[PDB]
Amino acid sequence: EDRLKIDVIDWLVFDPAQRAEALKQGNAIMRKFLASKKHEAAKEVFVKIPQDSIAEIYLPAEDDNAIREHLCIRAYLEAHETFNEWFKHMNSVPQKPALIPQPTFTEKVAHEHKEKKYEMDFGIWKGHLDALTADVKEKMYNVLLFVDGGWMVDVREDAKEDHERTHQMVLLRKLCLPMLCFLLHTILHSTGQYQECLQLADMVSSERHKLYLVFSKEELRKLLQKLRESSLMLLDQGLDPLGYEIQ
């Protein structure tokens, strides 16, 4: 039935006079797929939506929200497109030169070089990494700290009742905000940014976002056993739990 739904979109996109209904329905369809984490499904739909839809449509409470929801959804997708690239890279680290104990004088020199070339690649694989870390992070904070009212949260409050959508928007927050936090923690930990890891407890507990309400009690503790792990590595470095110099 996947196709039935992703195909009803091209029918609504065809007629430009129904772009407001095409987007709204595109949202709904992408709300079902997100709850299943079908990101190639959600995105295959996301491209069918002409890149210039938003511009033309220009506002009923149903169109202000659907424009916001669409960008929220793009902010979410882009937060998985850049992580899978980053993650793919983290798993392609240059491998150490192989050792040939009891080497011939030939094998000694081939190895002096293979050992010197590797000490060039590992520097760039931290180079490319840093730039894929700086980018995946930004996206994770665009979703977690979504501007003007939080992610998947309507700004317009005068639409007509849509319990399906509304409760789909509360759920999407409870499936994906705990899951984006845990990823960002995994990104920060993987790159050794431990001080910042611990600063996820400010972001989450914050009264500005009230992200902690989107967490189950279990997920919290889990995030608290994740942070205590970053803390350790900060002690091993000689700093206090939170990364500040011990005077």
Partner 1 sequence: KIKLLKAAFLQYCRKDLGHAQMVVDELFSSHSDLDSDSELDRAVTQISVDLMDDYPASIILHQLEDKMKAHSFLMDFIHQVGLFGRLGSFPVRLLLCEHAEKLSAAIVLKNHHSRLSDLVNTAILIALNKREYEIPSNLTPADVFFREVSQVDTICECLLEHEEQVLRDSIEWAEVVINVNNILKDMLQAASHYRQNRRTVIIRQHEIVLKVAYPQADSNLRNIVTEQLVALIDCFLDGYVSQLKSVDKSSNRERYDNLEMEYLQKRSDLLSPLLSLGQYLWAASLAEKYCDFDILVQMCEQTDNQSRLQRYMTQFADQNFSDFLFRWYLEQHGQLANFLQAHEHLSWLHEINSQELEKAHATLLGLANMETRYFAKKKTLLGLSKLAALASDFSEDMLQEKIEEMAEQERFLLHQETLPEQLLAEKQLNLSAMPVLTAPQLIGLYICEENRRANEYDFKKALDLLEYIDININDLKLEILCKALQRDNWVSKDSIFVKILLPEVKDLLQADEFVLKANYEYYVQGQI
**Identity of the residue, 22 or 214, whose beta carbon is nearer to partner 1 in the bound complex:** 214
For the bound state, the minimum distance from the C-beta of residue 221 to partner 1, rounded and expressed in Å, comes to 5
Retrieve residue 89's tokens: 């890279």
Q: Please identify which residue in the block is written with the tokens 């240059």.
A: 94
Q: Name the region of 239 (left: φ>0; alpha: ψ -120 to 50; beta: rest).
A: beta
* Separation between Cα atoms, residue 14 and residue 79, nearest integer Å: 29
DSSP track, 57-83? H---HHHHHHHHHHHHHHHHHHHHHHH
28/183 with CB nearer partner 1 = 183
The angle that helices 19-34 and 2-14 make with each other, rounded to 10 degrees, is 160
Q: Which of residues 80 and 209 has its CB atom nearest to partner 1 in the complex?
A: 209
* In the complex, minimum distance from the CB of residue 148 to partner 1, in angstroms, rounded to a whole number: 18
Q: In this structure, what DSSP letter does residue 213 have?
A: G
Choice between 1 and 202, CB closer to partner 1: 202
Interacting residues toward partner 1 by CB under 8 A: 198-199, 201-202, 204-207, 212, 217, 220-221, 223-225, 227-228, 231, 241-242, 244, 247
Helices marked H in 91-162: 105-144
Q: What share of the chain is helix, strand, coil (3-state, %, to 5)?
A: 75, 0, 25
Closest approach of partner 1 to the CB of residue 135, in Å? 23
Shortest distance in whole angstroms from residue 201 CB to partner 1: 4
Q: How far is the CB of 240 from partner 1 (least distance, A)?
A: 8
CB 78 within 8 A of CB 70: no
Is the CB of 126 or the CB of 221 nearer to partner 1?
A: 221
